[PDB]
Amino acid sequence: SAVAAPVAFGFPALSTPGAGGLAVSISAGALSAAIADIMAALKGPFKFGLWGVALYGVLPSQIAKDDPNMMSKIVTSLPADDITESPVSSLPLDKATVNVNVRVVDDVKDERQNISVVSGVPMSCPVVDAKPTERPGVFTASIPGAPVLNISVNNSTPAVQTLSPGVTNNTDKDVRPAGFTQGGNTRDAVIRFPKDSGHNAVYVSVSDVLSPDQVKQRQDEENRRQQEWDATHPVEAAERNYERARAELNQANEDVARNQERQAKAVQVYNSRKSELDAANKTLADAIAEIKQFNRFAHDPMAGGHRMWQMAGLKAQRAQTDVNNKQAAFDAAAKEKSDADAALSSAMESRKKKEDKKRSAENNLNDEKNKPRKGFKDYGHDYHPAPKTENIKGLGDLKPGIPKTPKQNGGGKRKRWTGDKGRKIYEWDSQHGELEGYRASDGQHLGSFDPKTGNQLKGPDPKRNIKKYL
Amino acid sequence: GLKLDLTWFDKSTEDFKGEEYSKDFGDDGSVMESLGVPFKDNVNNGCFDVIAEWVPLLQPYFNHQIDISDNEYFVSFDYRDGDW
């Protein structure tokens, strides 16, 4: 029910939704070359996979809220045609979704949530029909799990020129693999306006601004999924484990080179400070010898030679004070040259350690690369296919049920069915190719049944039950 | 070949509301790679919860319009030789 400063396509509007919802005011105009170029680069024919480029970084702690206990949202809009694989206009008015070549999603990489554009794999977006409001030019759109949108688009109006606190464009613009949890906290959609409204379709992506704690949960999840993947892909694992060694080695080389510079400069300063001390000491040694030369007047306050002696003392103090400053500078240089020598040596060490490390990696990469790898079709034969609900015979009418029993291997849950008016549960045992029956209320095992006939292959096992999963 | 078996139930009643089979992908299981699901012990072996981030990646293969706000979705990766 509010209003917002006009924003341009690609711009990440930051706001803390009210009871009325989110306000979306778009400053129409061909998308910036900066964004358009990034998108162009992202589409570059890369290997199959979902790739992304982080456009903005979100900084929760910098959010200028009314009350820290709030839910801020970042809303990025783009012209629908720039996203959809096919012009939105050439789409049946009864379609609820549409394929897209790029989406703007929230992704977490290094303990930070960012707004990125991703592409490289087939994707679909919901098509939401915007509705009119009493206020002309103002439409409402309801996207799945997001506050109601009060969208407004103007052919030509000002545009916010600077990012709000909490969002920065200072990000690693390199193309990288989208995360496992990409878009985990984003809800997007192509918004199409009323028949004779005159507005072109607009893509809109709404992301929740995650808190430091929530960013951590995402990152831990990313980590766990990456590890599960590495655990099941020896080669791919060895690849990144080696690439990582390749980098750590290079970083160790730049390390030694940096320490060689520190040492070279330390030597230069050392010699220089040493010469200055050496010269300062000459002056001091001559002023001391001069007091000695006139010491014979040290007790004759009346003689003019006493003035020479007295003056000599003054010259000696001035020379000592200078020597003291010179000695301190030289000592600092000596400590620097010593630390630089140890650091350079230490860098030399780590660099060697890194060299061995990269060898173990470059070798293992080949060892695992020389092994036999089973193809997809092989995996498709490791377990027995599950029967189609309507093909399970001899058990009366069956209706699928929410999977819950954890699988022994892999990450799935056993396929579950319901029979006898929801009193009997049947789960598919893919390792033996048979159904296992269980009593609904008790969870107690009833036996093994053949899907083709419905006959009992084995009787009830008292030791088996799935009460823990209903 | 490979088929995505999608099933969904009502969030509150937990009652079955529907099932749909995607087209046959033959021996192309790249779909599971986009979901980050290893092939090992997962083909013809389990149903997976359709988490939110996965909807945009799965919706292209199904006529049913996935609605995770009203239902709970599950998908299994079934493989049988040839057409079926």
Tab-separated table of N, CA, C and O in Angstrom, chain A residues 97-151:
chain	number	residue	atom	x	y	z
A	97	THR	N	3.087	-21.162	-16.297
A	97	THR	CA	4.533	-21.049	-16.210
A	97	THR	C	5.132	-20.878	-17.591
A	97	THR	O	4.437	-21.018	-18.597
A	98	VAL	N	6.429	-20.584	-17.627
A	98	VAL	CA	7.152	-20.377	-18.877
A	98	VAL	C	8.638	-20.703	-18.708
A	98	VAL	O	9.208	-20.485	-17.642
A	99	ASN	N	9.258	-21.236	-19.753
A	99	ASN	CA	10.674	-21.572	-19.703
A	99	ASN	C	11.503	-20.302	-19.743
A	99	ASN	O	11.097	-19.324	-20.359
A	100	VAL	N	12.661	-20.309	-19.091
A	100	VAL	CA	13.510	-19.127	-19.090
A	100	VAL	C	14.962	-19.529	-19.258
A	100	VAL	O	15.359	-20.626	-18.861
A	101	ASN	N	15.750	-18.634	-19.852
A	101	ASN	CA	17.168	-18.887	-20.088
A	101	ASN	C	18.033	-18.361	-18.962
A	101	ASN	O	19.192	-18.755	-18.822
A	102	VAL	N	17.482	-17.458	-18.166
A	102	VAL	CA	18.230	-16.906	-17.043
A	102	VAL	C	17.283	-16.523	-15.913
A	102	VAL	O	16.153	-16.118	-16.158
A	103	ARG	N	17.757	-16.661	-14.678
A	103	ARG	CA	16.993	-16.262	-13.501
A	103	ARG	C	17.933	-15.487	-12.581
A	103	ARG	O	19.152	-15.628	-12.658
A	104	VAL	N	17.355	-14.651	-11.732
A	104	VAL	CA	18.119	-13.892	-10.757
A	104	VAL	C	17.809	-14.608	-9.443
A	104	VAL	O	16.659	-14.614	-8.995
A	105	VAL	N	18.820	-15.230	-8.845
A	105	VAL	CA	18.636	-15.972	-7.599
A	105	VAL	C	19.630	-15.560	-6.523
A	105	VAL	O	20.641	-14.925	-6.805
A	106	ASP	N	19.341	-15.927	-5.281
A	106	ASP	CA	20.231	-15.592	-4.191
A	106	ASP	C	21.105	-16.824	-3.984
A	106	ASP	O	20.618	-17.953	-3.961
A	107	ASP	N	22.408	-16.611	-3.888
A	107	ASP	CA	23.343	-17.718	-3.743
A	107	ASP	C	24.367	-17.375	-2.661
A	107	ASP	O	24.719	-16.217	-2.482
A	108	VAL	N	24.844	-18.385	-1.947
A	108	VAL	CA	25.812	-18.179	-0.882
A	108	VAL	C	27.142	-18.836	-1.251
A	108	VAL	O	27.181	-20.031	-1.534
A	109	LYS	N	28.226	-18.058	-1.264
A	109	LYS	CA	29.538	-18.595	-1.654
A	109	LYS	C	30.596	-18.650	-0.556
A	109	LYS	O	31.080	-19.732	-0.178
A	110	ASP	N	30.993	-17.500	-0.045
A	110	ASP	CA	32.009	-17.540	0.993
A	110	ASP	C	31.510	-16.837	2.227
A	110	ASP	O	31.988	-15.762	2.570
A	111	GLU	N	30.528	-17.450	2.876
A	111	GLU	CA	29.966	-16.891	4.086
A	111	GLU	C	29.260	-15.573	3.784
A	111	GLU	O	29.193	-14.683	4.630
A	112	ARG	N	28.745	-15.439	2.564
A	112	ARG	CA	28.019	-14.227	2.183
A	112	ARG	C	26.913	-14.508	1.177
A	112	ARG	O	27.100	-15.271	0.234
A	113	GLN	N	25.761	-13.881	1.384
A	113	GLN	CA	24.645	-14.041	0.469
A	113	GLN	C	24.802	-13.041	-0.678
A	113	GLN	O	25.115	-11.874	-0.447
A	114	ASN	N	24.606	-13.482	-1.914
A	114	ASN	CA	24.701	-12.541	-3.027
A	114	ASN	C	23.538	-12.713	-4.000
A	114	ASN	O	22.836	-13.730	-3.973
A	115	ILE	N	23.316	-11.709	-4.839
A	115	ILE	CA	22.253	-11.771	-5.842
A	115	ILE	C	22.970	-12.041	-7.161
A	115	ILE	O	23.791	-11.230	-7.587
A	116	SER	N	22.690	-13.178	-7.794
A	116	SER	CA	23.355	-13.539	-9.055
A	116	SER	C	22.390	-13.863	-10.191
A	116	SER	O	21.191	-14.048	-9.973
A	117	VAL	N	22.916	-13.908	-11.416
A	117	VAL	CA	22.104	-14.300	-12.555
A	117	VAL	C	22.671	-15.660	-12.868
A	117	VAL	O	23.880	-15.859	-12.765
A	118	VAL	N	21.811	-16.613	-13.200
A	118	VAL	CA	22.292	-17.944	-13.495
A	118	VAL	C	21.700	-18.454	-14.793
A	118	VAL	O	20.627	-18.024	-15.220
A	119	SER	N	22.419	-19.365	-15.430
A	119	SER	CA	21.963	-19.920	-16.691
A	119	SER	C	22.781	-21.161	-16.964
A	119	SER	O	23.751	-21.439	-16.252
A	120	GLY	N	22.377	-21.927	-17.971
A	120	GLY	CA	23.134	-23.119	-18.325
A	120	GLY	C	22.386	-24.434	-18.225
A	120	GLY	O	22.920	-25.489	-18.563
A	121	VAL	N	21.139	-24.369	-17.780
A	121	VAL	CA	20.336	-25.564	-17.609
A	121	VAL	C	18.888	-25.149	-17.838
A	121	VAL	O	18.563	-23.969	-17.714
A	122	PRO	N	18.009	-26.096	-18.225
A	122	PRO	CA	16.597	-25.772	-18.456
A	122	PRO	C	15.967	-25.281	-17.148
A	122	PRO	O	16.220	-25.838	-16.073
A	123	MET	N	15.150	-24.243	-17.239
A	123	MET	CA	14.531	-23.680	-16.059
A	123	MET	C	13.150	-23.157	-16.402
A	123	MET	O	12.874	-22.820	-17.546
A	124	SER	N	12.289	-23.076	-15.397
A	124	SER	CA	10.938	-22.602	-15.611
A	124	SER	C	10.585	-21.569	-14.550
A	124	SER	O	11.116	-21.602	-13.442
A	125	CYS	N	9.700	-20.644	-14.900
A	125	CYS	CA	9.264	-19.611	-13.975
A	125	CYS	C	7.762	-19.550	-13.987
A	125	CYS	O	7.128	-19.850	-14.986
A	126	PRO	N	7.169	-19.141	-12.870
A	126	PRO	CA	5.714	-19.042	-12.800
A	126	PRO	C	5.274	-17.790	-13.546
A	126	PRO	O	5.970	-16.770	-13.533
A	127	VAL	N	4.127	-17.874	-14.202
A	127	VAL	CA	3.583	-16.730	-14.901
A	127	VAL	C	2.422	-16.219	-14.054
A	127	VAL	O	1.394	-16.879	-13.930
A	128	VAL	N	2.600	-15.052	-13.457
A	128	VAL	CA	1.574	-14.459	-12.619
A	128	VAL	C	0.858	-13.334	-13.363
A	128	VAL	O	1.503	-12.454	-13.945
A	129	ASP	N	-0.471	-13.368	-13.350
A	129	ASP	CA	-1.267	-12.332	-14.007
A	129	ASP	C	-1.472	-11.185	-13.022
A	129	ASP	O	-1.997	-11.391	-11.933
A	130	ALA	N	-1.047	-9.981	-13.393
A	130	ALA	CA	-1.216	-8.828	-12.513
A	130	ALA	C	-2.650	-8.317	-12.595
A	130	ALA	O	-3.282	-8.389	-13.649
A	131	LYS	N	-3.168	-7.802	-11.486
A	131	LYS	CA	-4.533	-7.288	-11.469
A	131	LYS	C	-4.560	-5.768	-11.265
A	131	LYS	O	-3.645	-5.192	-10.681
A	132	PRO	N	-5.613	-5.098	-11.766
A	132	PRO	CA	-5.774	-3.646	-11.645
A	132	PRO	C	-6.033	-3.203	-10.214
A	132	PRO	O	-6.413	-4.006	-9.368
A	133	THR	N	-5.834	-1.913	-9.966
A	133	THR	CA	-6.047	-1.308	-8.655
A	133	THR	C	-6.776	0.000	-8.909
A	133	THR	O	-6.824	0.474	-10.045
A	134	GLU	N	-7.349	0.590	-7.870
A	134	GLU	CA	-8.044	1.852	-8.058
A	134	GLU	C	-7.085	2.901	-8.614
A	134	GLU	O	-7.461	3.727	-9.446
A	135	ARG	N	-5.839	2.845	-8.159
A	135	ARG	CA	-4.815	3.779	-8.601
A	135	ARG	C	-4.297	3.349	-9.979
A	135	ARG	O	-3.750	2.254	-10.132
A	136	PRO	N	-4.489	4.199	-11.004
A	136	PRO	CA	-4.034	3.893	-12.365
A	136	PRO	C	-2.518	3.695	-12.413
A	136	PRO	O	-1.774	4.333	-11.663
A	137	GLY	N	-2.069	2.815	-13.306
A	137	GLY	CA	-0.649	2.538	-13.430
A	137	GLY	C	-0.157	1.620	-12.324
A	137	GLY	O	0.955	1.093	-12.391
A	138	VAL	N	-0.993	1.418	-11.308
A	138	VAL	CA	-0.639	0.568	-10.174
A	138	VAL	C	-1.353	-0.779	-10.208
A	138	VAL	O	-2.574	-0.843	-10.116
A	139	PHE	N	-0.576	-1.851	-10.324
A	139	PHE	CA	-1.110	-3.208	-10.380
A	139	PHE	C	-0.631	-4.069	-9.207
A	139	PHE	O	0.379	-3.763	-8.568
A	140	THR	N	-1.357	-5.146	-8.927
A	140	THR	CA	-0.992	-6.052	-7.846
A	140	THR	C	-0.678	-7.413	-8.442
A	140	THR	O	-1.347	-7.862	-9.370
A	141	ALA	N	0.355	-8.059	-7.926
A	141	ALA	CA	0.735	-9.374	-8.418
A	141	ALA	C	1.096	-10.216	-7.213
A	141	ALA	O	1.814	-9.767	-6.318
A	142	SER	N	0.582	-11.437	-7.190
A	142	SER	CA	0.830	-12.337	-6.081
A	142	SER	C	1.718	-13.488	-6.499
A	142	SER	O	1.313	-14.367	-7.260
A	143	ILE	N	2.950	-13.453	-6.009
A	143	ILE	CA	3.918	-14.486	-6.311
A	143	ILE	C	3.948	-15.461	-5.145
A	143	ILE	O	3.909	-15.051	-3.989
A	144	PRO	N	4.003	-16.767	-5.442
A	144	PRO	CA	4.049	-17.856	-4.471
A	144	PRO	C	4.341	-17.486	-3.026
A	144	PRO	O	3.439	-17.114	-2.277
A	145	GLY	N	5.600	-17.584	-2.623
A	145	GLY	CA	5.931	-17.285	-1.236
A	145	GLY	C	6.508	-15.910	-0.975
A	145	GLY	O	7.463	-15.761	-0.207
A	146	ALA	N	5.927	-14.895	-1.599
A	146	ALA	CA	6.421	-13.545	-1.411
A	146	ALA	C	5.322	-12.556	-1.099
A	146	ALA	O	4.158	-12.783	-1.397
A	147	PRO	N	5.682	-11.430	-0.480
A	147	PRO	CA	4.653	-10.437	-0.171
A	147	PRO	C	3.982	-10.015	-1.488
A	147	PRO	O	4.572	-10.155	-2.570
A	148	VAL	N	2.755	-9.507	-1.394
A	148	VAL	CA	2.021	-9.055	-2.570
A	148	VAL	C	2.793	-7.890	-3.201
A	148	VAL	O	3.326	-7.017	-2.500
A	149	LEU	N	2.861	-7.896	-4.528
A	149	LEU	CA	3.576	-6.869	-5.285
A	149	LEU	C	2.677	-5.750	-5.761
A	149	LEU	O	1.628	-6.003	-6.336
A	150	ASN	N	3.092	-4.515	-5.528
A	150	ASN	CA	2.336	-3.371	-6.008
A	150	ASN	C	3.233	-2.790	-7.103
A	150	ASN	O	3.908	-1.791	-6.897
A	151	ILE	N	3.233	-3.450	-8.258
A	151	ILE	CA	4.067	-3.070	-9.386
A	151	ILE	C	3.584	-1.843	-10.135
A	151	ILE	O	2.382	-1.622	-10.307
